[PDB]
Specification:
Chain E: One of its GO terms (cellular component) is cytosolic large ribosomal subunit. Chain E: It comes from Entamoeba histolytica (strain ATCC 30459 / HM-1:IMSS / ABRM). Chain E: Keywords: Ribonucleoprotein, Ribosomal protein. Chain E: Belongs to the eukaryotic ribosomal protein eL34 family. This is part of a larger assembly, with chains A (about 70 residues), B (about 90 residues), C (about 250 residues), D (about 140 residues) and E (about 100 residues). With about 90 residues, chain B is α+β, with helices and mostly antiparallel strands. Helix content of chain B is about 35%, strand content about 20%. In chain B, strands 1-2-3-4 form a 4-stranded antiparallel β-sheet, with no helix packed on it. The radius of gyration of chain B is 18 Å and the shape is elongated. The N and C termini of chain B lie far apart (about 60 Å). In chain C, about 5% of the residues lie in helices and about 25% in strands. The longest helix of chain C has 7 residues, at about 180-185. In chain C, about 30% of the residues are buried. Chain D has helices at about 55-65, 90-95, 110-125, and strands spanning about 5-10, 20-25, 40-45, 65-75, 80-85. Chain D is built from 3 helices and 5 strands; from the N terminus they run E-E-E-H-E-E-H-H. In chain D, a hairpin with an 8-residue loop joins strand 1 (about 5-10) and strand 2. By secondary structure, chain D is of the alpha+beta class. Classes of the chains: A alpha/beta (about 70), B alpha+beta (about 90), C mainly beta (about 250), D alpha+beta (about 140), E alpha+beta (about 100). Chains in contact: B-C, D-E. The interface of B and C includes residues 38 and 77 of B. The structure holds 3 RNA strands.
Chain lengths: ~70, ~90, ~250, ~140, ~100
Amino acid sequence: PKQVQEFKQILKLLKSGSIRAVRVKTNGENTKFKVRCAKYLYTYICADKAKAEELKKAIPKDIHVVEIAKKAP
Amino acid sequence: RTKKVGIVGKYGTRYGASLRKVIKKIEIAQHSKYVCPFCCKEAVRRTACGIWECKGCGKQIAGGAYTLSTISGATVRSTVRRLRDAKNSQ
Amino acid sequence: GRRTLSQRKGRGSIFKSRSHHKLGVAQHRAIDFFERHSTVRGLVKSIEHDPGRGAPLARVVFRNPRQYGLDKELFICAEGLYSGQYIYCGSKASLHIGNVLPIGQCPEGTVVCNVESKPGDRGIIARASGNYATVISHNADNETTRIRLPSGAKKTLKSNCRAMVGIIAGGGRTEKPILKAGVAYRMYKAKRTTWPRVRGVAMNPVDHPHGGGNHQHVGHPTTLKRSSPPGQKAGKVAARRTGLIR
Amino acid sequence: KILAPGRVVIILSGRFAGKKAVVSSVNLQGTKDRKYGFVTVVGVERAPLKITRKMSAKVQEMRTSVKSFCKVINVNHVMPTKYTVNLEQFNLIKQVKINNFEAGKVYPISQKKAISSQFAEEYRKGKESWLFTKLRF
Amino acid sequence: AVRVTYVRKHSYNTKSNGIRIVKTAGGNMTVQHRQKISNGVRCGDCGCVLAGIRHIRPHQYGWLGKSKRTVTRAYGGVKCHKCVQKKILRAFLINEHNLIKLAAA
RNA sequence: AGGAUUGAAAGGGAAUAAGAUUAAUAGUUCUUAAUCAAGAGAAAUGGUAACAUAUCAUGAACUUUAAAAUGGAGUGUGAAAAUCUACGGAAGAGUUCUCUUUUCUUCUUAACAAAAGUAAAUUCCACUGAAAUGAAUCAAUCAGAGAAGUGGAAUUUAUUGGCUUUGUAAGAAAUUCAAUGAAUUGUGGUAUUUUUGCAGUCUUCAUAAAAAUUAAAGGGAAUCUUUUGCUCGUAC
RNA sequence: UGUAAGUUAGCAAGAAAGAGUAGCUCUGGUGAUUAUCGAAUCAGAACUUUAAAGGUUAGGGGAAUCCGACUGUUUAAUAAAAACAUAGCAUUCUGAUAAAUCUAAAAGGUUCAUUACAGAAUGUGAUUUCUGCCCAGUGCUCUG
RNA sequence: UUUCACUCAUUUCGUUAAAUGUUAA
């Protein structure tokens, strides 16, 4: 697994056509946007709610989105 | 520390006074440092029987088994130098 | 009777040489035109310890007088050689320690080592630690020179036999007294199986000709003819003399 | 003065070890930022290759081409030679000063190829040989 | 303390059978296989360990980047900088001496 | 171009881990997350230097160097784990007519990668030139073929880069609670042992393997996605 | 605390011999960091008792004589030793196409990847002191 | 028959069978 640092790369990754799945996890302090690509599982630790919403709109509707919470699926 | 048995006190009391005497002279000269013929430093120590290495100088020298230069091996170098000079001159 | 220990030595089963960590064959390089009529220069890359022998070995590196590459040789160190030294092999080589010259060019009285008994056979005589041979005289009529072997014997060789000027390194090795049985055990690490030697008188009559009776003794003279068969040739052989020398 | 403009040196250390350079400006004291005695040199990074009479004339041009370099070097990392070039002939070298060199940024490529062409044309005329012949270690 | 077992079928403390015991979720301790300690490179002349190159297994050098298996210098990766400096001076000084000694003395 | 066959389930060797699962198999199955090999879609900069740059930035024949690949002893020390312990707690359990702010249990984290913060040791580079000689270790040992000082570079420290930290990753697992759903999961130690490295010292008439295989150099000849990974052992 | 004769001057030597040691309450020494923190270790003092290493673990000592110098090995299943080995000392042969020696033979094989400071064959058994006389007999040898 | 001189069988060797011998330069 790899970790992306700032906001610019994740959108470029999201807009890239190499995506396969997206899973969003909400923790007691932050929100993680794990993007499942072909090779790696990129993740992004987000602590700003407004910036998280911007990310959620950036997700193409065709891809499958999994929401994870205190109870695992 | 010791009256007269300096380096051969590690042999204790079990090899004969005469044999411990002979081995003392050889072991002292085998473990001492010698003047290095290329850098004039007391920095040559034996690595194996016949191989001597200059520590702070980076050279390997072939020598005697326990001493850097043997008496027989020193006169020979003198002899060859005289022979070479005579041959080169007429 | 049985077959004695000297008979079992000639089959070479456990008496084979323990030569696994040895460096290799130590000898001059093969003779060629450039050694017959010129000089080839070698570089003493390093001096190494060859197991089983008391003299150090030099890893000389000549270049390639006829092709491209390196000719990694393996000489026997002469006393005084050092790493990074240049040595010249050939008929025109200067009379310096470590140089290889035909035995005819050496002035009478020169001390050489690693001499070839026959031209081009890459070294026979004067190869142990501290040993050397002296040139006695030349004979230009039949191209022969006389040398004095380390045993004292005089030998006549061809004047073009090669030899290395100097003294084999590591002299004075045997003057240090072994003190312990264990130390002698380690001496034959890279040699044959010979060390713990049981006296013939301590054996039984089947084992050895000396294997005695109610008192440990030989019984018959220990000086024997050279023609004795293997099996009874035990002791002094063709002894011209006995007893302490005066 | 051993180290004077126009003197040919051989670089002893660094990426350009073994290359032949030409001294342009000398400073044995060193500037504020340069705490060492240095010299600004222009050298032949890639020596020209030998050519024969069978290659086409366009090949002989690229084969005889010279790739040069300009570098500030400590005077303790150069070994001056006995050969001296004329900076009047190599007028492009004379413009290489300490203020032309900035720390951490790429030397101008256009200037480097400018001197490189000047080096090549001089060698094509054969006037200077020891500078352009390669050193075999 | 939690006692562990060899995971592979080797059962002897050989050089290639080295292991490390590390902790794991639930308090259990698992067994890893650790790599052998390797030597680096040496100068072809002075036999000194070269700087700038890692001490890894021979095959792992191919995995490294092209610039991470050498040093950007003449004879880089086979000779030390001191080894190289002596080479240059020998090549230049001897050649210059040959021009004065012989070749129109 | 150079020498044929065989010879190691303890020598060399491309690449995988955590959790779960079975009446029994599991670095082999399942979930998740990785790695490796073979394939498919006139030719670079920076640094004074040691040297450094997400593939970059061409590099044939031929030749050399290095790795694979090297004894043992003893001393010092870096790091991890276990045990012990300091402070702060959360949950459960035991004793309790004699006391005990009490005694005990749980408080965890992989392969592979990242680079906030920050180490020990060794070797080199630049400035300068040491005598009133200095620098240093438990011991040593070192210096005008250049010490000490200041500023740098590199390598090693059980994967990337050693340790804390981060992604994996809490969604797992452990300890409790309720009847599947809920809670918590700090920071340290000039302590002992073990493991693993490192540094120098001692010792040998002992010097303590080879090849497959890989990389680099000298030389200048030529002009990210995807497929596949066969045979045999595997119970006890 | 104390320790002899003897000695290869290294040892003997843990020689021999004597005293102390428990529990509890205290006191002091040995550092780090710059007042706070930390380590088991040593020494000392009052008091008490059933007077203290001893549950377990845990050398009997001395005076001599013989043999072997020592560490080591040995008759698996009645002999572990004074026997074998050992270092040291001494003798004999051999210049390598040799000496020893395996094989029926052999561009065959072992010491030998070696070269007299080496290879092969023997006796004695560390050190110190010393090895006397005999070449007739039997061997061995002669450059005769 | 002995003593010579030679090599041509024969022995013992060395190498990548890598300038041997005689003229020439």
